[PDB]
Amino acid sequence: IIYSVNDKVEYEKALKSFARKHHLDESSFFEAFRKFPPFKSEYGSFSEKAIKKLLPLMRLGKYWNYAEIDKYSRERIQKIITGEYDENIKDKVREKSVHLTIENDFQGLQLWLAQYIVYGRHSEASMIGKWNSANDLEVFLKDF
RNA sequence: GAGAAUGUCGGGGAGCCGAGGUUGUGAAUUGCUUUCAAAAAUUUUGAAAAGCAAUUCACAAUAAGGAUUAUUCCGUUGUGAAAACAUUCAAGGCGGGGCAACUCGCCUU
């Protein structure tokens, strides 16, 4: 509500309607909720869906549970604990995931571990590439 | 070297608006010059028009031009022969926001 409707009259109308639907008295609700500095215009590197897929793995403790890991990452977790051979899992993974013997070991993984398990790439590894003729070059300029 | 996170300093692009200036029209006042045009002693005064103006106000335009009736625009950018582009660009659904137009998120190809 705060982030989306950035217009004054619309803002107090949304605030009053929110205070009506939610059983909270619209007496100090709108007075406290009128003076908000507007959110600083900045956006993160990733999107909502990607971070949604990422967070459950690096959760640990009571805030973590196995059911919140999606189908693909659960399958990859089973593959890692099993130790079987997958084309989408590299040898460096097993090198790093030697401690990931049990499903309980998937608690509090760092950014790189969770990112790889979710999407299978050890960060941005680039593509190197190699042009073969003037055709590639002129295409590159055409697409600039 | 790469990724992410937090601060600092810059640059670029797009957008919503404001005040002048200028050119022209009309008007109020006051001038310079010329001609008509009378009076008076080549010269001085008086009526009219034109040319150029000055101070103030209202208005028209503000790249020549071309659309359109959406409370929308394109016209000083780049590429290059196609006088053709780029700078808006799919479909749904599940939602938040308002008097609603409209605006803002989530999910699947």
XYZ file of N, CA and C in Angstrom, chain A residues 66-144:
237
model
N 11.363 -28.163 5.626
C 11.729 -28.799 4.363
C 10.657 -28.591 3.300
N 9.404 -28.398 3.720
C 8.297 -28.288 2.777
C 8.337 -27.013 1.942
N 9.076 -25.991 2.368
C 9.136 -24.727 1.643
C 10.202 -24.713 0.556
N 10.968 -25.791 0.412
C 11.904 -25.960 -0.690
C 11.121 -26.504 -1.876
N 11.243 -25.846 -3.027
C 10.419 -26.205 -4.170
C 10.821 -27.574 -4.725
N 10.099 -27.994 -5.766
C 10.265 -29.343 -6.301
C 11.670 -29.563 -6.851
N 12.178 -28.609 -7.635
C 13.473 -28.803 -8.283
C 14.610 -28.817 -7.268
N 14.589 -27.893 -6.305
C 15.655 -27.865 -5.309
C 15.554 -29.050 -4.356
N 14.335 -29.521 -4.067
C 14.198 -30.749 -3.287
C 14.773 -31.944 -4.037
N 14.506 -32.031 -5.342
C 15.082 -33.106 -6.142
C 16.603 -33.034 -6.138
N 17.159 -31.828 -6.272
C 18.614 -31.693 -6.265
C 19.194 -31.999 -4.888
N 18.460 -31.679 -3.821
C 18.894 -32.039 -2.473
C 18.955 -33.554 -2.324
N 17.927 -34.248 -2.820
C 17.938 -35.708 -2.791
C 19.087 -36.264 -3.620
N 19.370 -35.643 -4.767
C 20.478 -36.093 -5.604
C 21.818 -35.895 -4.903
N 21.973 -34.775 -4.196
C 23.230 -34.491 -3.511
C 23.439 -35.453 -2.350
N 22.408 -35.661 -1.525
C 22.562 -36.569 -0.390
C 22.744 -38.002 -0.877
N 22.086 -38.363 -1.982
C 22.257 -39.696 -2.547
C 23.654 -39.889 -3.122
N 24.237 -38.838 -3.695
C 25.539 -38.956 -4.318
C 25.527 -39.526 -5.716
N 24.361 -39.605 -6.352
C 24.247 -40.164 -7.690
C 24.735 -39.147 -8.723
N 24.752 -39.557 -9.989
C 25.356 -38.777 -11.061
C 24.292 -38.002 -11.830
N 24.431 -36.677 -11.853
C 23.541 -35.810 -12.612
C 24.372 -34.927 -13.530
N 23.884 -34.738 -14.758
C 24.544 -33.836 -15.692
C 24.494 -32.385 -15.231
N 23.439 -31.988 -14.520
C 23.293 -30.612 -14.061
C 23.997 -30.348 -12.736
N 24.671 -31.344 -12.168
C 25.455 -31.186 -10.950
C 26.911 -31.471 -11.285
N 27.790 -30.535 -10.944
C 29.196 -30.625 -11.304
C 30.011 -31.249 -10.172
N 31.280 -31.540 -10.476
C 32.159 -32.163 -9.490
C 32.528 -31.188 -8.379
N 32.684 -29.904 -8.718
C 32.956 -28.891 -7.703
C 31.838 -28.826 -6.674
N 30.617 -29.172 -7.079
C 29.485 -29.171 -6.157
C 29.708 -30.200 -5.061
N 30.057 -31.414 -5.472
C 30.288 -32.479 -4.509
C 31.500 -32.112 -3.676
N 32.501 -31.492 -4.296
C 33.646 -31.010 -3.532
C 33.196 -30.100 -2.395
N 32.291 -29.164 -2.691
C 31.820 -28.237 -1.666
C 30.746 -28.866 -0.784
N 29.885 -29.708 -1.359
C 28.760 -30.288 -0.634
C 29.100 -31.621 0.020
N 30.371 -31.846 0.361
C 30.740 -33.067 1.071
C 30.100 -33.091 2.455
N 29.949 -31.918 3.078
C 29.325 -31.854 4.395
C 27.813 -32.021 4.315
N 27.226 -31.838 3.131
C 25.777 -31.933 2.949
C 25.345 -33.394 2.790
N 25.635 -34.183 3.825
C 25.312 -35.607 3.787
C 23.822 -35.848 4.007
N 23.208 -35.091 4.912
C 21.830 -35.330 5.319
C 20.978 -34.126 4.931
N 19.661 -34.347 4.884
C 18.733 -33.272 4.544
C 18.722 -32.188 5.615
N 19.109 -32.539 6.844
C 19.219 -31.550 7.909
C 20.402 -30.613 7.712
N 21.423 -31.033 6.961
C 22.575 -30.185 6.683
C 22.233 -28.986 5.808
N 21.061 -28.976 5.171
C 20.642 -27.856 4.328
C 19.984 -26.765 5.176
N 20.736 -26.306 6.173
C 20.313 -25.217 7.038
C 21.390 -24.145 7.035
N 20.983 -22.909 6.768
C 21.917 -21.797 6.821
C 23.010 -21.830 5.775
N 22.654 -22.137 4.531
C 23.617 -22.130 3.439
C 23.897 -20.694 3.020
N 25.122 -20.423 2.578
C 25.451 -19.071 2.155
C 24.826 -18.775 0.791
N 25.095 -17.568 0.286
C 24.461 -17.120 -0.951
C 24.836 -18.015 -2.126
N 26.121 -18.349 -2.255
C 26.577 -19.131 -3.399
C 25.991 -20.541 -3.382
N 25.974 -21.182 -2.210
C 25.427 -22.534 -2.108
C 23.955 -22.567 -2.497
N 23.152 -21.696 -1.883
C 21.724 -21.671 -2.173
C 21.466 -21.306 -3.628
N 22.215 -20.336 -4.158
C 22.031 -19.934 -5.548
C 22.319 -21.086 -6.497
N 23.406 -21.822 -6.252
C 23.708 -22.955 -7.116
C 22.633 -24.026 -7.008
N 22.207 -24.350 -5.785
C 21.222 -25.417 -5.633
C 19.919 -25.035 -6.323
N 19.543 -23.757 -6.254
C 18.304 -23.324 -6.890
C 18.434 -23.333 -8.411
N 19.549 -22.822 -8.951
C 19.640 -22.616 -10.392
C 20.861 -23.228 -11.071
N 21.776 -23.850 -10.332
C 22.807 -24.665 -10.949
C 23.969 -23.940 -11.589
N 24.261 -22.705 -11.183
C 25.403 -21.968 -11.715
C 26.198 -21.357 -10.571
N 27.510 -21.603 -10.565
C 28.412 -21.029 -9.565
C 28.635 -19.561 -9.913
N 27.659 -18.733 -9.534
C 27.647 -17.308 -9.852
C 27.724 -17.086 -11.358
N 28.096 -15.877 -11.770
C 28.189 -15.541 -13.186
C 29.549 -15.993 -13.707
N 29.562 -17.098 -14.450
C 30.790 -17.678 -14.974
C 31.117 -17.213 -16.386
N 30.333 -16.285 -16.941
C 30.547 -15.733 -18.277
C 30.428 -16.799 -19.361
N 30.570 -16.389 -20.623
C 30.471 -17.306 -21.748
C 31.689 -17.299 -22.659
N 32.677 -16.438 -22.407
C 33.924 -16.371 -23.168
C 33.636 -15.983 -24.613
N 33.009 -16.886 -25.365
C 32.631 -16.613 -26.738
C 33.788 -16.495 -27.712
N 33.490 -16.626 -29.002
C 34.488 -16.451 -30.055
C 33.765 -16.176 -31.364
N 33.979 -14.991 -31.928
C 33.436 -14.670 -33.240
C 34.216 -15.415 -34.317
N 33.528 -15.785 -35.395
C 34.124 -16.608 -36.439
C 34.392 -15.851 -37.734
N 33.650 -14.785 -38.008
C 33.772 -14.055 -39.267
C 33.252 -12.641 -39.047
N 33.340 -11.822 -40.097
C 32.784 -10.475 -40.033
C 31.276 -10.485 -39.825
N 30.614 -11.617 -40.085
C 29.172 -11.703 -39.874
C 28.818 -11.473 -38.410
N 29.546 -12.126 -37.496
C 29.301 -11.935 -36.070
C 29.506 -10.484 -35.666
N 30.598 -9.897 -36.134
C 30.888 -8.515 -35.800
C 29.758 -7.616 -36.244
N 29.429 -7.662 -37.527
C 28.416 -6.756 -38.055
C 27.061 -6.990 -37.399
N 26.753 -8.231 -37.013
C 25.546 -8.484 -36.230
C 25.636 -7.782 -34.879
N 26.813 -7.833 -34.252
C 26.994 -7.209 -32.944
C 26.772 -5.705 -33.024
N 27.226 -5.099 -34.113
C 27.025 -3.672 -34.289
C 25.560 -3.391 -34.614
N 24.931 -4.258 -35.407
C 23.521 -4.078 -35.738
C 22.649 -4.125 -34.489
N 23.004 -4.976 -33.530
C 22.229 -5.149 -32.310
C 22.623 -4.174 -31.208
N 23.609 -3.313 -31.448
C 24.027 -2.364 -30.425
C 22.937 -1.331 -30.169
